[PDB]
Amino acid sequence: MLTLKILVYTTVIFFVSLFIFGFLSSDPSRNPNRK
Amino acid sequence: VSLWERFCAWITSTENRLYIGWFGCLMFPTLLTATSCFIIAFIAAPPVDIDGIREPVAGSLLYGNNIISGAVVPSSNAIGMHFYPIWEAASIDEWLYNGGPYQLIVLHFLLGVSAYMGREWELSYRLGMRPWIFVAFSAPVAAASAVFLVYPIGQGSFSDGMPLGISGTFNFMLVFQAEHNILMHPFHMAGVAGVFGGSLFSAMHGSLVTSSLIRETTENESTNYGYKFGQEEETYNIVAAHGYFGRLIFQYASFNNSRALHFFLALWPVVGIWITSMGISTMAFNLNGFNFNQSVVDSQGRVINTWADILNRANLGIEVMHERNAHNFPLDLA
Amino acid sequence: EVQFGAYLAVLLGTFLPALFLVNLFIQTEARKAGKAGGQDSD
Amino acid sequence: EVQFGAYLAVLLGTFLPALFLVNLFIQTEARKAGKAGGQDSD
Amino acid sequence: MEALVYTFLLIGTLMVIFFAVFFRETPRIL
Amino acid sequence: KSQINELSYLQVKGTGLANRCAEVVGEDSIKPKPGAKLVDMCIEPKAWAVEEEVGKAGKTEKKFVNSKVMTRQTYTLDAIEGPITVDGGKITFNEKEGIDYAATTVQLPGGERVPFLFTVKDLVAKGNGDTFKPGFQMGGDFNTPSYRTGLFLDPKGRGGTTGYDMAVALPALQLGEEGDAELFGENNKVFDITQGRIEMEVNKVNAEDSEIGGVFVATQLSDTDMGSKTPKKVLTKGIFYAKVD
Amino acid sequence: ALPWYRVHTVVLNDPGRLIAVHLMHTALVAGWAGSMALYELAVFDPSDPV
Amino acid sequence: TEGTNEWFGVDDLRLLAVLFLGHWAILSLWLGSYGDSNEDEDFFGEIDYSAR
Amino acid sequence: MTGPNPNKQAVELNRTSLYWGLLLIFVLAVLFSSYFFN
Ligand code: CLA
Ligand code: CLA
Ligand code: CLA
Ligand code: CLA
Ligand SMILES: CC(C)=CCC/C(C)=C/CC/C(C)=C/CC/C(C)=C/CC/C(C)=C/CC/C(C)=C/CC/C(C)=C/CC/C(C)=C/CC/C(C)=C/CC1=CC(=O)C(C)=C(C)C1=O
Ligand SMILES: CCCCCCCCCCCCCCCC(=O)OC[C@H](CO[C@@H]1O[C@H](CS(=O)(=O)O)[C@@H](O)[C@H](O)[C@H]1O)OC(=O)CCCCCCCCCCCCCCC
Ligand SMILES: CCCCCCCCCCCCCCCC(=O)OC[C@H](COP(=O)(O)OC[C@@H](O)CO)OC(=O)CCCCCCCCCCCCCCC
Ligand SMILES: CC1=C(/C=C/C(C)=C/C=C/C(C)=C/C=C/C=C(C)/C=C/C=C(C)/C=C/C2=C(C)CCCC2(C)C)C(C)(C)CCC1
Ligand code: OEX
Ligand SMILES: [Fe+2]
Known part of the structure; x- marks a missing residue:
């Protein structure tokens, strides 16, 4: 009820931004082949 | 050296107890909220207007239920397809009345299962595995999104969605029979063949390995202790189980290749459940199964009954009785 | 009328508690058969 | 009204039955600690 | 009084799931 | 208002505006004509209260506790028509048509859900004087129908005008001379009509626009599910609005 | 070789597991008071507090 | 007000400052390592193993 | 984890002390049952 609502958009785009900037973090290079 | 690189090194570490990964960044917060709301809504949750007629259906344990009858009730017919979060409900009492937690559980479930699926990909990348276990898990993800997401979309309401329970499942299956005739639809036919075939080739492969085990134990200890973990010797005579099934049916019907054998175990169920979950999907938009009612006639023109006409009279019994107060007009358009 | 929680x-x-005291005896005899090294230790 | 014998x-x-399956595990670990001969066999 | 048994069966089932995941007998080569 | 009529349909929907009665502006007098017929009377309650046994310091006299509505925005009456007949002493109103019932459900402390049909069916209003004034005050009785029409089926499948009439999955109850007469009350479904007393009060009139509006107070009785329980007295308050024509 | 009434004296010369035990008595005391008070709210009836 | 056609469900002005400070608070973490790097260094691979 | 605890001991209960503890529970069950059933 507009105080809870603020709390959800924090928590969503906290973890969504960890997802988005996780695969931008040179993620294909993280393999057991090399580096 | 940086704080982000020391965080990416931890979150993608296979040296954790459970691999978290980048999909776990939105698997774990989603599925723990679908869980922690499910346990509360299954145990302690007030009754829910499902038919939109202000007749609240009890579904939790504190309101006199058990494991079988208790269920998280779907949302109201009054809401229908509208998004109904907590902050758009003006109190939690108004939220729990109108079928609140069904949308909170389901939407955090389908995000967490579609992230559990991508997490099975990710660890296969970091371990050197060939990647496609997550394609086999697409088959229950197709079926979970068919009864919780796609079928409420094409029917236009989450109230037609599947109730999160055990007796609510059979309320879902029978009402789906009367309104859509799923048993005559060839995609439920192609997945009954998927799980009857799947449980066949499971118990047929699991018997021929256990039949042809090599002597490594005594008769006092267990059969299973003849396998030391991580050994490089083959633990069963595969030529023996090939010569058995090569005589049990005939010679040319037997896979001598164990790789092509262990692929056919993954093909048959998964293709059977992809096809089935697109049976619920095409019947979400009212493209029903076959209808052979009044199909056999004599030369006079009188209707001769068939087995489909007996099956029709079972469908007419459920059709005239499902949601016995919600209807006002002669045709169940919804 | 009796109390049904009795x-x-x-x-x-x-x-x-009686199944508890059985367990302390079975693991006692297993340790004695464990050290003894004959036909039952494994 | 429910049945009070349930x-x-x-x-x-x-x-x-669940306390039964615990006992077969405790005496299993006691035999393994019995043969091992160190600090726990007695 | 009746639903107290059902709750104890459910959270008691989730206990042995917890112990099976974290206190598992870790398999070892050699 | 006319300000509401300025908007289109796509601007009103989803905003919760169609639930709310209009706000009349200004105060003057208006006289009902001989053939005067009331046009757009809407009634919307803004607060609800159910008579209960309240926990005071040492006493348990009956008082009204308030309650939170749980059906969302479906409480307002609308489009209520009716001719305004002129008796000599007092101007009267008798409603004829329009949406004059709005079923709703409020929740008490303790978790009890009390549904009630909020209605103004067969209303006979009577108010002092002839012309509508800011001091005008009319009211009268209305008949509440039952919350369920007699062909409603309960969970066992029993209704007043349809359904079974015995416990359908308890077939050994109708054995003996007594039958199932111990649970007789839950088999006989009785359609119930009660009374309600609304008291309206005009306080703001337009005569150049011929639309009035003021504060009411309505009391009635909640439902019983055809004799399943004792119904409870429900008080409510709000604002109304009417077009006098 | 401990008797059954001396089984919990392995924690005498171990401060690190003296805490893990004292935390487990705390997790049972606190879990009691939560699950006792949940049991009492299913039984309580606020109809007449007089 | 549910069925309003508002961007990302942003009903009030206060919810924007939540969104901007969520993407940027992790963006600034990300630029602490992958930002301020050479934007002109290529490869003829399928996959780059350049640096941290 | 850390290393193995040097405070590992073993628990014993001979056949004698089994029958004491069984009879202790059944006689307390005989005694206190009549009061619990009330
Ligand atoms: C991080 C994982 C996660 C995810 C994905 C969700 C997702 C959701 N939650 Mg949930 N929740 C979470 C964690 C999460 N939750 C946690 C940890 C808690 C506990 C505090 C909750 C508690 C909670 C409650 C209590 C409720 C929800 C609700 C919801 C739903 C709507 C919330 C909303 O407005 O999203 C905000 C989303 C956005 C603003 C969109 C972000 C998407 C970005 C912008 C990516 C898009 C990229 C863009 C298109 C690129 C454009 C490029 C341009 C050039 C065009 C949604 C399904 C509600 C619900 O389901 O009710 C039915 C609800 O009531 N959640
Ligand atoms: C259904 C979920 C799903 C899953 C498990 C995967 C899985 C995969 N995708 Mg993929 N993808 C999907 C949907 C999905 N995809 C969709 C729907 C799109 C179109 C928008 C894409 C576009 C896409 C591209 C362009 C790339 C991948 C890549 C990959 C691989 C690595 C993960 C990655 O970085 O992608 C990140 C994850 C996504 C892009 C999808 C996130 C899906 C979330 C977790 C659930 C579904 C939510 C929904 C689609 C988002 C709605 C937001 C809105 C409400 C605001 C992996 C095999 C990469 C790869 O390896 O290619 C070789 C790659 O570069 N995907
Ligand atoms: C001999 C009888 C028979 C058989 C074998 C089947 C077989 C099947 N029917 Mg069918 N049916 C029958 C008779 C039969 N039918 C009759 C008589 C009727 C009319 C009443 C129907 C009506 C009917 C309907 C209406 C539906 C089926 C469906 C299905 C399929 C179910 C598979 C499924 O959903 O798994 C797929 C797996 C899942 C859905 C589960 C997903 C779970 C996710 C991945 C994870 C969950 C994790 C969990 C929460 C926690 C994990 C544990 C935790 C501790 C970690 C299967 C092909 C369903 C279908 O078509 O497929 C959708 C369906 O909706 N049938
Ligand atoms: C602050 C409380 C406290 C603490 C921390 C201890 C701690 C200890 N006591 Mg001690 N004790 C206490 C109170 C306490 N005692 C009291 C109040 C008495 C009087 C009854 C005793 C009498 C006593 C004796 C006679 C002996 C000890 C012994 C011991 C040591 C080992 C305990 C053991 O092996 O039991 C293991 C116990 C069991 C395996 C099962 C016991 C089953 C009980 C009887 C019934 C079940 C308990 C029940 C569920 C508890 C309900 C909660 C209730 C307390 C509110 C340990 C140092 C022993 C010692 O000196 O160490 C060498 C010893 O011989 N204590
Ligand atoms: C002279 C007179 C008197 C005149 C009368 C004329 C007369 C004599 C008539 C009589 C003739 C008569 C009728 C005889 C015909 C005999 C006959 C065939 C009768 C039976 C009737 C009948 C309906 C039979 C058809 C049914 C039949 C047996 C079908 C077979 C089904 C089939 C082909 C299944 C294959 C499935 C399959 C691919 C399995 C492999 C996959 C699987 C996981 C297996 C496991 C497995 C396999 C391995 O391979 C190995 C290696 C290992 C490790 C392993 O895990
Ligand atoms: C009137 C119209 C007539 C029909 C018209 C045709 C329509 C389209 C037909 C589509 C054919 C697709 C061919 C795919 C071949 C392939 O899968 O190879 C995969 C391998 C290759 O074989 C392996 O091949 C290897 C040799 S090599 O790879 O092929 O060179 C060999 O090493 C190995 O031993 C051998 O097993 O085969 C196997 O492992 C066995 C599985 C075979 C699967 C084909 C059956 C069809 C699917 C089952 C039915 C659906 C299941 C769900 C039902 C509910
Ligand atoms: C919530 C969880 C609930 C937890 C409950 C679980 C614990 C319950 C059981 C534990 C107590 C067990 C007692 C074991 C008993 C036990 O094993 O005895 C043996 C024990 C000590 O024996 P030793 O030191 O010889 O032990 C050597 C070791 O090898 C084994 O203990 O004696 C006592 O501790 C004191 C004597 C009590 C013996 C009982 C004497 C009274 C006799 C019975 C009287 C009844 C007949 C009366 C006739 C009128
Ligand atoms: C894991 C772990 C551990 C362990 C722990 C322990 C060992 C525990 C204990 C536990 C315990 C020790 C428990 C207890 C519990 C109890 C309970 C759970 C009880 C219950 C009961 C009841 C509930 C009762 C009821 C009743 C009846 C039945 C009848 C009558 C009435 C009455 C009420 C009495 C440690 C730390 C070492 C280490 C780490 C980890
Ligand atoms: O909501 Mn659940 O079920 Ca699908 O059909 Mn129409 O809607 Mn209602 O009726 Mn029938
Ligand atoms: Fe295999």
Whole structure:
């Protein structure tokens, strides 16, 4: 009820931004082949 | 050296107890909220207007239920397809009345299962595995999104969605029979063949390995202790189980290749459940199964009954009785 | 009229502590058969 | 109205067979600690 | 009084799931 | 208002505006004509209260506790028509048509859900004087129908005008001379009509626009599910609005 | 070789497991008071507090 | 007000400052390592193993 | 984890002390049952 609502958009785009900037973090290079 | 690189090194570490990964960044917060709301809504949750007629259906344990009858009730017919979060409900009492937690559980479930699926990909990348276990898990993800997401979309309401329970499942299956005739639809036919075939080739492969085990134990200890973990010797005579099934049916019907054998175990169920979950999907938009009612006639023109006409009279019994107060007009358009 | 929570008091007051004391005896005899090294140690 | 003999069915159907399976594990670990000969055999 | 048994069966089932995941007998080569 | 009529349909929907009665502006007098017929009377309650046994310091006299509505925005009456007949002493109103019932459900402390049909069916209003004034005050009785029409089926499948009439999955109850007469009350479904007393009060009139509006107070009785329980007295308050024509 | 009434004296010369035990008595005391008070709210009836 | 056609469900002005400070608070973490790097260094691979 | 605890001991209960503890529970079950059933 507009105080809870603020709390959800924090928590969503906290973890969504960890997802988005996780695969931008040179993620294909993280393999057991090399580096 | 940086704080982000020391965080990416931890979150993608296979040296954790459970691999978290980048999909776990939105698997774990989603599925723990679908869980922690499910346990509360299954145990302690007030009754829910499902038919939109202000007749609240009890579904939790504190309101006199058990494991079988208790269920998280779907949302109201009054809401229908509208998004109904907590902050758009003006109190939690108004939220729990109108079928609140069904949308909170389901939407955090389908995000967490579609992230559990991508997490099975990710660890296969970091371990050197060939990647496609997550394609086999697409088959229950197709079926979970068919009864919780796609079928409420094409029917236009989450109230037609599947109730999160055990007796609510059979309320879902029978009402789906009367309104859509799923048993005559060839995609439920192609997945009954998927799980009857799947449980066949499971118990047929699991018997021929256990039949042809090599002597490594005594008769006092267990059969299973003849396998030391991580050994490089083959633990069963595969030529023996090939010569058995090569005589049990005939010679040319037997896979001598164990790789092509262990692929056919993954093909048959998964293709059977992809096809089935697109049976619920095409019947979400009212493209029903076959209808052979009044199909056999004599030369006079009188209707001769068939087995489909007996099956029709079972469908007419459920059709005239499902949601016995919600209807006002002669045709169940919804 | 008797109290129906007394069946749960007595029959768990018997079985749960008495099955406990059996376990301390079975693992006692297993340690003695464990050290002894003959036909039962494994 | 529920049957008051069902509490005795369930809570002994849980505890009596589940406390049985615990005992077979405790004496299993006691035999392994019995043969091993160090600090726990006695 | 009746639903108290159902709750104890459910959270008691989730206990042995917890112990099976974290206190598992870790398999070892050699 | 006319300000509401300025908007289109796509601007009103989803905003919760169609639930709310209009706000009349200004105060003057208006006289009902001989053939005067009331046009757009809407009634919307803004607060609800159910008579209960309240926990005071040492006493348990009956008082009204308030309650939170749980059906969302479906409480307002609308489009209520009716001719305004002129008796000599007092101007009267008798409603004829329009949406004059709005079923709703409020929740008490303790978790009890009390549904009630909020209605103004067969209303006979009577108010002092002839012309509508800011001091005008009319009211009268209305008949509440039952919350369920007699062909409603309960969970066992029993209704007043349809359904079974015995416990359908308890077939050994109708054995003996007594039958199932111990649970007789839950088999006989009785359609119930009660009374309600609304008291309206005009306080703001337009005469150049011929639309009035003021504060009411309505009391009635909640439902019983055809004799399943004792119904409870429900008080409510709000604002109304009417077009006098 | 401990008797059954001396089984919990392995924690005498171990401060690190003296805490883990004292935390487990705390997790049972606190879990009691939560699950006792949940049991009491299913039984309580606020109809007449007089 | 549910069925309003508002961007990302942003009903009030206060919810924007939540969104901007969520993407940027992790963006600034990300630029602490992958930002301020050479934007002109290529490869003829399928996959780059350049640096941290 | 850390290393193995040097405070590992073993628990014993001979056949004598089994019958004491069984008879202790059943006689307390005989005694206190009549009061619990009330
Ligand atoms: C991080 C994982 C996660 C995810 C994905 C969700 C997702 C959701 N939650 Mg949930 N929740 C979470 C964690 C999460 N939750 C946690 C940890 C808690 C506990 C505090 C909750 C508690 C909670 C409650 C209590 C409720 C929800 C609700 C919801 C739903 C709507 C919330 C909303 O407005 O989203 C905000 C989303 C956005 C603003 C969109 C972000 C998407 C970005 C912008 C990516 C898009 C990229 C863009 C298109 C690129 C454009 C490029 C341009 C050039 C065009 C949604 C399904 C509600 C619900 O389901 O009710 C039915 C609800 O009531 N959640
Ligand atoms: C259904 C979920 C799903 C899953 C498990 C995967 C899985 C995969 N995708 Mg993929 N993808 C999907 C949907 C999905 N995809 C969709 C729907 C799109 C179109 C928008 C894409 C576009 C896409 C591209 C362009 C790339 C991948 C890549 C990959 C691989 C690595 C993960 C990655 O970085 O992608 C990140 C994850 C996504 C892009 C999808 C996130 C899906 C979330 C977790 C659930 C579904 C939510 C929904 C689609 C988002 C709605 C937001 C809105 C409400 C605001 C992996 C095999 C990469 C790869 O390896 O290619 C070789 C790659 O570069 N995907
Ligand atoms: C001999 C009888 C028979 C058989 C074998 C089947 C077989 C099947 N029917 Mg069918 N049916 C029958 C008779 C039969 N039918 C009759 C008589 C009717 C009319 C009443 C129907 C009506 C009917 C309907 C209406 C539906 C089926 C469906 C299905 C399929 C179910 C598979 C499924 O959903 O798994 C797929 C797996 C899942 C859905 C589970 C997903 C779970 C996710 C991945 C994870 C969950 C994790 C969990 C929460 C926690 C994990 C544990 C935790 C501790 C970690 C299967 C092909 C369903 C279908 O078509 O497929 C959708 C369906 O909706 N049938
Ligand atoms: C602050 C409380 C406290 C603490 C921390 C201890 C701690 C200890 N006591 Mg001690 N003790 C206490 C109170 C306490 N005692 C009291 C109040 C008495 C009087 C009854 C005793 C009498 C006593 C004796 C006679 C002996 C000890 C011994 C011991 C040591 C080992 C305990 C053991 O092996 O039991 C293991 C116990 C069991 C395996 C099962 C016991 C089963 C009980 C009887 C019934 C079940 C308990 C029940 C569920 C508890 C309900 C909660 C209730 C307390 C509110 C340990 C240092 C022993 C010692 O000196 O160490 C060498 C010893 O011989 N204590
Ligand atoms: C002279 C007179 C008197 C005149 C009368 C004329 C007369 C004599 C008539 C009589 C003739 C008569 C009728 C005889 C015909 C005999 C006959 C065939 C009768 C039976 C009737 C009948 C309906 C039979 C058809 C049914 C039949 C047996 C079908 C077979 C089904 C089939 C082909 C299944 C294959 C499935 C399959 C691919 C399995 C492999 C996959 C699987 C996981 C297996 C496991 C497995 C396999 C391995 O391979 C190995 C290696 C290992 C490790 C392993 O895990
Ligand atoms: C009137 C119209 C007539 C029909 C018209 C045709 C329509 C389209 C037909 C589509 C054919 C697709 C061919 C795919 C071949 C392939 O899968 O190879 C995969 C391998 C290759 O074989 C392996 O091949 C290897 C040799 S090599 O790879 O092929 O060179 C060999 O090493 C190995 O031993 C051998 O097993 O085969 C196997 O492992 C066995 C599985 C075979 C699967 C084909 C059956 C069809 C699917 C089952 C039915 C659906 C299941 C769900 C039902 C509910
Ligand atoms: C919530 C969880 C509930 C937890 C409950 C679980 C614990 C319950 C059981 C534990 C107590 C067990 C007692 C074991 C008993 C036990 O094993 O005895 C043996 C024990 C000590 O024996 P030793 O030191 O010889 O032990 C050597 C070791 O090898 C084994 O203990 O004696 C005592 O501790 C004191 C004597 C009590 C013996 C009982 C004497 C009274 C006799 C019975 C009287 C009844 C007949 C009366 C006739 C009128
Ligand atoms: C029936 C009945 C009843 C009830 C009762 C009950 C309810 C009980 C319960 C009880 C309980 C429920 C109890 C519990 C207890 C427990 C315990 C005693 C435990 C212990 C623990 C431990 C042993 C731990 C361990 C560990 C871990 C896990 C990890 C780490 C390490 C350690 C060691 C810490 C009554 C009387 C009312 C009435 C009558 C009848
Ligand atoms: O909501 Mn659940 O079920 Ca699908 O059909 Mn129409 O809607 Mn209602 O009726 Mn029938
Ligand atoms: Fe295999």
